[PDB]
Amino acid sequence: ASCTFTDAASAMASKTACSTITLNNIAVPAGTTLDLTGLTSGTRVIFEGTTTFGYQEWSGPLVSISGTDITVQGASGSVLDGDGARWWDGQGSNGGKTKPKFFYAHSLDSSSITGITIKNSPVQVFSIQSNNLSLTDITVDDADGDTQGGHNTDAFDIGSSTYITITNANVHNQDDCIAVNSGENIIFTGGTCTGGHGLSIGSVGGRSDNTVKNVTIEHSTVTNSQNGVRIKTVYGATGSVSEVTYSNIQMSGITNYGIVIEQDYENGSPTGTPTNGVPITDLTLNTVTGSVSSGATEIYILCGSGSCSSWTWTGVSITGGSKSTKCENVPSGVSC
């Protein structure tokens, strides 16, 4: 049966009995999840109009969807508006108000999400922990967070996932455009990332899953962001990052690091001393080009002893700013 809901309680009560679920202009109660987990395999979910959320200090998620063979779609003009300025205090997930993560895609397997627009997320947007999930034509409009205190507004956080494909994302936020904490067979292509902290592998380490393998981030643009390309592995942690390719990345207006690969990472501040428990091997950068701002550093590589090997570095050209005086353990064929 096809079902159309204008309230969250009805949608959650009846979701399994509906093979098409249209969610029209739903105001989700404060402190609660629009809980679309456990869907019957094959179900299509359509977001129409503007979805809103009541105010409460809590950890979220605001929305969660799970199931096999699920098709999630944002109708034309649809928006999931978190009105996150109600929470934003410059502190994000580091302190201040407790703020809800937006959209859990945990075990949304052999599934797709297309044409969803998120506006003004309180904190991180997509939490991806799935197998065979594509995210296409996703828009994260967190631009208001640049002046209203947004922080830790990651667009795509990926962990314990396989076969994730993100295509034609458009993100304006205040943190990582993508952050691959762990996963295998990941593609991010055709993205535009502005305002945030770059296209990041990591942080890797310190979790149950600390393994990244076969990730391609390609044909994408990073502008007006703290970093362009970033790999961050956690200080003193254990893990593995292998078969990562950044290819055909352009950047401009980068404020801190055009490319930064560091094995001393901590959330508060990098230690400045790398460790060697998270080896980065078979890393390819192929055509990573653009400019950084005058106060920025072009390329920064801080590798531990023996934990960066077998890299391929071709067509890398970052102009502007300054060259680093701090690079350590740079692999053969690579340069700051």
Q: Are 109 and 131 in contact (CB under 8 A)?
A: yes
Of 157, 175, 176, 264, the catalytic one is 175
Whether the upstream peptide bond of residue 203 has omega within 30° of 0, thus cis, is: yes
Both tokens of residue 154? 């990651």
d(CA 181, CA 202): 4
Q: How many helices (H) and strands (E) does the chain have?
A: 2, 31
Both tokens of residue 120? 């003004």
Q: State how far the alpha carbon of 82 is from the alpha carbons of 29, 50, 117, 125, 177, in Å.
A: 12, 10, 11, 10, 18
Both tokens of residue 295? 């106060």
Of 109, 142, 154, 197, the catalytic one is 197
- Identify the burial level of 86 via C-beta atoms within 10 angstroms of its C-beta, where 0-12 means exposed, 13-18 middle and 19 or more buried: middle
Q: Which residues contact 95 (CB under 8 A, 6 or more apart)?
A: none
Q: Could you confirm whether 197 is annotated as catalytic? A: yes
Looking at residue 94, what DSSP letter applies?
Answer: G
Looking at residue 143, what DSSP letter applies?
Answer: T
Q: Could you confirm whether 209 is annotated as catalytic? A: no
Query: What is the amino acid identity at position 16?
Result: T
Closest CA relative to residue 275, chosen from 244, 246, 238: 238
Q: How many CA atoms lie within 13 A of 197 on its CB side?
A: 23
Q: Are 47 and 80 in contact (CB under 8 A)?
A: yes
d(CA 302, CA 110): 38
Q: State how far the alpha carbon of 187 is from the alpha carbons of 78, 132, 282, in Å.
A: 26, 11, 16
Segments making up each domain of the chain, as ranges: 1-336
d(CA 267, CA 278): 16
218: left (phi over 0), alpha (psi -120 to 50) or beta: beta
d(CA 48, CA 216): 32
Closest CA relative to residue 171, chosen from 199, 133, 149: 199
Q: Are 299 and 258 in contact (CB under 8 A)?
A: yes
Cα torsion through 80, 82, 85, 87, rounded to 10: -170
Both tokens of residue 203? 């942080």
Q: How many CA atoms lie within 13 A of 83 on its CB side?
A: 11
Closest CA relative to residue 263, chosen from 295, 229, 300, 228: 300
Map tokens 């629009």 to a residue: 34
- Identify the burial level of 173 via C-beta atoms within 10 angstroms of its C-beta, where 0-12 means exposed, 13-18 middle and 19 or more buried: buried
Q: Are 88 and 57 in contact (CB under 8 A)?
A: no
Q: What are phi and psi of 21, to 5 degrees?
A: -120, 110
